Amino acid sequence: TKLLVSLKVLVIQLNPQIGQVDQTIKRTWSILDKVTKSATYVKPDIILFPEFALTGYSFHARKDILPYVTKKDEGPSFELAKSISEKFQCYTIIGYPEEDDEQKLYNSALVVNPQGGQIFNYRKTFLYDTEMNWDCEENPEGFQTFPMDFSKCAKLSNEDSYNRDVTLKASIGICMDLSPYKFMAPFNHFEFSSFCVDNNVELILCPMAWLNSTSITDKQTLHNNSLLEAAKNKIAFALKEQGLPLAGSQGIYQLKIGDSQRTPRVPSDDSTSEYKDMDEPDMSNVNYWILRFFPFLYFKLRINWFKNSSLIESILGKTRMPLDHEYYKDKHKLLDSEEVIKDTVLEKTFLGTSLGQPWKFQGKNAILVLANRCGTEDGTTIFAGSSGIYKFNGKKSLDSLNESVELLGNLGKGLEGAILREVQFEVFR
Numbered sequence: 475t476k477l478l479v480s481l482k483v484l485v486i487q488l489n490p491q492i493g494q495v496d497q498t499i500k501r502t503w504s505i506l507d508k509v510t511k512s513a514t515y516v517k518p519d520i521i522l523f524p525e526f527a528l529t530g531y532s533f534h535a536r537k538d539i540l541p542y543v544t545k546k547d548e549g550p551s552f553e554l555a556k557s558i559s560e561k562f563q564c565y566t567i568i569g570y571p572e573e574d575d576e577q578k579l580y581n582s583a584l585v586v587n588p589q590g591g592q593i594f595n596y597r598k599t600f601l602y603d604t605e606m607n608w609d610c611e612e613n614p615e616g617f618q619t620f621p622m623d624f625s626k627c628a629k630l631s632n633e634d635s636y637n638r639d640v641t642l643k644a645s646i647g648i649c650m651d652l653s654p655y656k657f658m659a660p661f662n663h664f665e666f667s668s669f670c671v672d673n674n675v676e677l678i679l680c681p682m683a684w685l686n687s688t689s690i691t692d693k694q695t696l697h698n699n700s701l702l703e704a705a706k707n708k709i710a711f712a713l714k715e716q717g718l719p720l721a722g723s724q725g726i727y728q729l730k731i732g733d734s735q736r737t738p739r740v741p742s743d744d745s746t747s748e749y750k751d752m753d754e755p756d757m758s759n760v761n762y763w764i765l766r767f768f769p770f771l772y773f774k775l776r777i778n779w780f781k782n783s784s785l786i787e788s789i790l791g792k793t794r795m796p797l798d799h800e801y802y803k804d805k806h807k808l809l810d811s812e813e814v815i816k817d818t819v820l821e822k823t824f825l826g827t828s829l830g831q832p833w834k835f836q837g838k839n840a841i842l843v844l845a846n847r848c849g850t851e852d853g854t855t856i857f858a859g860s861s862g863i864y865k866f867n868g869k870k871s872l873d874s875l876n877e878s879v880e881l882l883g884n885l886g887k888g889l890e891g892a893i894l895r896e897v898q899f900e901v902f903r
Contacts, residue, residue, distance in 0.1 A: 477903050479628050480636050481841070484509070484518035484564075484894045487861045487885050489724050489849030492530035495542070495550060499528060502554065505727050505892050514732030518894060519624055521558060523568035524847040524861075525581070525649050525683040527551070532851040536579075536608040543573040546584055546595040560590040565622060569648065569681040572597070580611050583646050583681050585620070594620045596646040599799075600655055600665070612800035617669040619645050622677065640901065644677040645670055649684055652766045655796045662825060665796075667767040671823050671835055676901055682846040684763075686756055686858040686887065687747040688712060696854065706853045712749045713850065716888070722849030722856075728753055728891035730883060737862065737881040739874045752888030755860035760884065761873040763844065769826035770835050770866040772878035779825070780832035788824040838868040839899040848888050859887040863895045 486505065490498045509515060525531070528551055533539040544551065551570035559566040565587060572582040572595075581601070585594035597613035598605075621641050628640040647666045654661055670678055685691070688709065695701045713720055740746070740757050747758040764771070779785050790809070795801035820829055828834040841863070848859035862884035869878055882895050 475902055476631060476900055477628050477638070477640060478631065478636075478900050479624075479640055479642075479898070481520070481624065481627055481897045481899075482516050482518045482894065483841075483843055483863055483897055484521045484892060485843060485845050485861045485863065485885070486521065486523050486527075487845065487859060487889075487891050487893075488524060488527055488847055489722055489857075489890050490526065490528055490530045490847065491721060491849070491851070492532070492538075494530070495528055499550065499554060501725060501890065504725075505890065506558070508727060508729060509731055509892055509894070512729065512731035516732060516894070516896065517562055518564050519627060520565045520622075521562070521567070522679055522843050522845040523555075523566075523681060524845045525569040525583075525681045526571060527568050527681070527847070528554070529571055530851065531683045531847070532604060532855060533608050539571055539579070539608045543571045543579060545574075546572055546582065547592050552584060552586075552592065555584060555586045556590045556592075559586045559588055563588040567646065567679055567681065578611050579608060580613070581605060581648060583648060585646075587623075596648070598648045598651065600650040600653060602650045614800050614804070616795045616799065616801045617645065617647070617651070617666060619643060619673050619675060640903075642676045642901070643674060644679060645673070645675045646679045646681070648680065649682045652680070652763070655799070659796060664766060664768050664825075667769050668823055670840075671769045671826065672821050674821070676840055678840065678842045680842070680844045682844060684759060684846050684858050686749055686856040687758060688749050689856045690854040702854075709850075709853060709856065712856075716750070716752060718752075718888075720850060720853055723752060723889050724849070726889060728886055728889040730885065730891075730893040732894055732896075733883075735883060737874075737884045739881065741871075741873055741875060749856055749887070751886070753886040755862065755884040756858045756887040757874070759858045760860060760862070760881075764864070764874055764876070764879055765872050767842065767866070767879075768872070769823060770840060770868075770879070771826070771872070771876050772833070772836075772868075772870055773826065776825070776827055776832040779827050785824050785827050786829065789822050789827070789829055790819070792822065792824055835866065835868050836870070838866075839901065840866045840868075841897055841899060842866065848890065859885060859889070861885045861893065863893070863897060865897065865899060
């Protein structure tokens with residue numbers, strides 16, 4: 475029934491800029507070379523890249539992004555992922571701009587197996603403001619799940635070596651997917667992480683292009699020629715004081731290969747959002763990210779929610795996706811009916827509580843992998859970097875101080891690089 479798993483996870487962090495695709499690919503191979511020659515190197519089972527890993531992110535018009543979109547099985551991103559997976563006998567996931575046969579555009583992440591074949595293609599479900607510039611499409615399928623077959627990565631309790639295979643249940647969420655829909659939905663919906671708990675996902679993968687707080691996100695301040703020129707000054711000063719060009723760091727690689735140094739548990743304040751110390755993570759965003767996975771976190775007040783049955787209506791009333799989403803446009807889908815209660819309903823959760831248990835994830839394990847880009851674009855937007863690997867142990871605050879999540883390691887906020895962690899956990903079969 476119980477099956478211990480050992481998994482080796484490699485995350486790549488990049489600073490891509492528009493019109494530098496070949497230079498970005500070359501720096502990638504440069505990083506991978508330094509990983510192999512590391513003192514404590516081990517062959518990874520899986521490798522994760524950020525959102526739009528090779529192309530840059532801030533496209534202003536459809537005509538600007540068109541020179542870089544590709545098919546899911548064609549182009550520089552696919553060929554790079556194919557070359558990498560065949561060389562390491564591993565899974566590789568990379569974010570890229572996609573075009574289909576009907577000339578429609580998506581923000582996507584493709585999956586390539588250890589045999590060099592593309593087994594999956596996920597499309598972004600919750601869109602960001604920038605996507606509207608080139609008329610990006612929402613995923614018609616909403617959030618999705620897929621299996622991943624790992625070889626010789628598991629063992630029984632009394633066994634001594636990992637000589638057993640294991641198929642894990644995985645899911646990909648891209649950047650905005652972790653946020654409330656359109657920044658208008660209720661915060662406590664936790665759409666993506668709820669989906670992951672409901673469907674019993676064991677491995678969560680998140681390519682990202684997530685912003686540091688000092689970024690300029692104001693409609694009034696970005697459209698006024700006088701306000702914007704004055705607004706950029708702060709950002710321009712922030713990077714000059716770090717001894718970096720406005721576009722941020724490139725070609726100087728931070729490596730954390732095989733070490734077991736874990737990220738310190740720290741609360742958020744008015745200092746943790748500052749763009750300083752490029753080799754250290756943005757702990758404001760790290761705390762925020764953990765918060766968006768609330769259903770996986772231990773919370774004392776759940777027992778009161780369960781005993782008082784104050785969430786039954788929410789659990790039963792909750793739909794699979796937001797009603798105005800692409801999901802229902804072309805989908806299509808109660809205590810009063812004569813229909814019976816299906817297994818699906820008993821798997822449903824809200825705020826981590828199900829109909830049968832106060833905390834559904836209690837006693838389970840799951841691994842979270844975030845690959846976020848670094849650097850800067852347009853002199854207005856600062857990406858937060860800080861890629862990392864996390865473990866939800868499911869044992870008995872709303873940040874990194876919560877010991878039901880383990881912070882296995884993070885990269886810094888401002889440097890390109892890579893981190894490898896050998897992750898141990900357990901599943902039930």
